[PDB]
Design a protein around this ligand. Structure first.
Ligand SMILES: CO[C@H]1O[C@H](CO)[C@@H](O)[C@H](O[C@H]2O[C@H](CO)[C@@H](O)[C@H](O)[C@@H]2O)[C@@H]1O
Ligand SMILES: CO[C@H]1O[C@H](CO)[C@@H](O)[C@H](O[C@H]2O[C@H](CO)[C@@H](O)[C@H](O)[C@@H]2O)[C@@H]1O
Ligand SMILES: CO[C@H]1O[C@H](CO)[C@@H](O)[C@H](O[C@H]2O[C@H](CO)[C@@H](O)[C@H](O)[C@@H]2O)[C@@H]1O
Ligand SMILES: CO[C@H]1O[C@H](CO)[C@@H](O)[C@H](O[C@H]2O[C@H](CO)[C@@H](O)[C@H](O)[C@@H]2O)[C@@H]1O
Ligand SMILES: CO[C@H]1O[C@H](CO)[C@@H](O)[C@H](O[C@H]2O[C@H](CO)[C@@H](O)[C@H](O)[C@@H]2O)[C@@H]1O
Ligand SMILES: CO[C@H]1O[C@H](CO)[C@@H](O)[C@H](O[C@H]2O[C@H](CO)[C@@H](O)[C@H](O)[C@@H]2O)[C@@H]1O
Ligand code: MMA
Ligand code: MMA
Ligand code: MMA
Ligand code: MMA
Ligand code: MMA
Ligand code: MMA
Lengths: 108, 108, 108, 108
């Protein structure tokens, strides 16, 4: 999958992926974007903890929490409560979108 | 693919798809959401033209244009110029998100 | 997913899918290949039962069984015990391959 | 895509991919299987050339050729002319299957 929907959570070792791109939430708490084996981006918080989990919040903030729930990193885009999506785009860019503007409402 | 990014266009017969869900821009100009062979949603503009094309605009408006460029249908969510995405979600709901809030900027 | 590996089973309502193609094992026991809403192929065994399940066997036979385990349909390609795969190809052709010839053995 | 069909070719930098798994035909001619950034398997032919291309042949042989068309590596599973598939399985195992046993013939 390449979309982390608001209200979801990438646990340790979990990741979004598309093509050769992998946005992985590592064990050492380093959220890294790899292009195959090459590191492309990273929160550079590796080692600050263990077993962290990336969380896309409804307020719009993309936060990396440690097991103790202390936030290690965050996009700081928190504020408007609503629906949001974190997408690992086809052009190798992880982007946050929101709030939702329209929907067919065909939701299950 | 299950994401129509703003600035993109589904031509006739083109579609977003995910699982058994297919959000197709048909020849008869009817934008329909199918769950396998069952119709789920539709703009109900079938027959109003031929060779239409769905366009996700930068202003946020999701418009169905005919070859003559006259809009046959639209979400009317036009307004704020920016980046938007139309996603055929995993829960069978086509939703529009925007503007973009954050990005790793790792864009190619 | 677009691959049913030998030893696996599509239950009722389950399906392989790729693009707009959906190879679905229906409730009425009719294994049908749809191209969006258009039926393309089918075992034409609909109604012969309820709650059937498609099974890709290790002997190479692709069988549609009813809950009572009586085979309703089968490719009759049974014979050589081994590894096989049923693939819903990108050209809209469901094909069976086997046995396996080579592998990196990198298996988890 | 995670299937290289017989008669197809991964050029330099091209790759099969699934999940965090990427079976890439590198510039240095090293066909490597990575699990994110960790190398898992490799033909160990890196440096033997430049701009190689992986080819899944109809005879069943999986060969890595150099631009000069000299084979640098091969699975040596050549022999029976027919249809074959190289699949980067969900269990992180690259496997070759063939020949084809059955098909709905729905081919486009
Ligand atoms: C400096 O290493 C940290 O940041 C790198 C990117 O800047 C990551 O690649 C790295 O993770 C990978 O390597 C470490 C070992 O150095 C390993 O523990 C991890 O599982 C990855 O393989 C680390 O986060
Ligand atoms: C300052 O709080 C915002 O930013 C923090 C990280 O910089 C987040 O931890 C914080 O999230 C928490 O509070 C919000 C609002 O109460 C809640 O919705 C979320 O689940 C966390 O508990 C917020 O984003
Ligand atoms: C009433 O038919 C229109 O709207 C339906 C949904 O309400 C669509 O399913 C339908 O499209 C499909 O059927 C038509 C023929 O009726 C066919 O031209 C089209 O390619 C689809 O198969 C149509 O849009
Ligand atoms: C003749 O109907 C059977 O075979 C068709 C293909 O030849 C299928 O499309 C059909 O399944 C679909 O329609 C039936 C109702 O006729 C419905 O029960 C099923 O869920 C599908 O929508 C059926 O198998
Ligand atoms: C020993 O290096 C070769 O084999 C490795 C696996 O055994 C590959 O990872 C490696 O490729 C990667 O690194 C090289 C530089 O050492 C780089 O040229 C290539 O693009 C990959 O990043 C190489 O094939
Ligand atoms: C010994 O030939 C087989 O193995 C070689 C590598 O070990 C392959 O290069 C070779 O392939 C070539 O010949 C076959 C048969 O003529 C042809 O189909 C293929 O396209 C290559 O030209 C064969 O696999
Ligand atoms: C109630 O939530 C659902 O519907 C909204 C819009 O109606 C979507 O944005 C969201 O992702 C879900 O599909
Ligand atoms: C009123 O203009 C807006 O809406 C129409 C359709 O309603 C689009 O054609 C146009 O580009 C704008 O999005
Ligand atoms: C310049 O556009 C790119 O970057 C923005 C955010 O920087 C994304 O929203 C967009 O989809 C592209 O990837
Ligand atoms: C004759 O036996 C074979 O074929 C039938 C269906 O024809 C399967 O049920 C069985 O497991 C074997 O594959
Ligand atoms: C033991 O089974 C595994 O390995 C064989 C080849 O070794 C594959 O064909 C099969 O799908 C599994 O990945
Ligand atoms: C003629 O080739 C097509 O059909 C055969 C079986 O008929 C498949 O194996 C192959 O991949 C193609 O789809």
């Amino acid at each position: 999958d390449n979309i982390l929907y608001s209200g979801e959570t990438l646990s340790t070792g979990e990741f979004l992926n598309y093509g050769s791109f992998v946005f992985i939430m590592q064990e050492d708490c380093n959220l890294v974007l790899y292009d195959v084996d090459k590191p492309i981006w990273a929160t550079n918080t590796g080692g600050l903890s263990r077993s962290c989990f990336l969380s896309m919040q409804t307020d719009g903030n993309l936060v990396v929490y440690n097991p103790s729930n202390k936030p290690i990193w965050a996009s700081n885009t928190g504020g408007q409560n609503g629906n949001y999506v974190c997408i690992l785009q086809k052009d190798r860019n992880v982007v946050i979108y929101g709030t939702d503007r329209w929907a067919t409402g065909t939701h299950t």
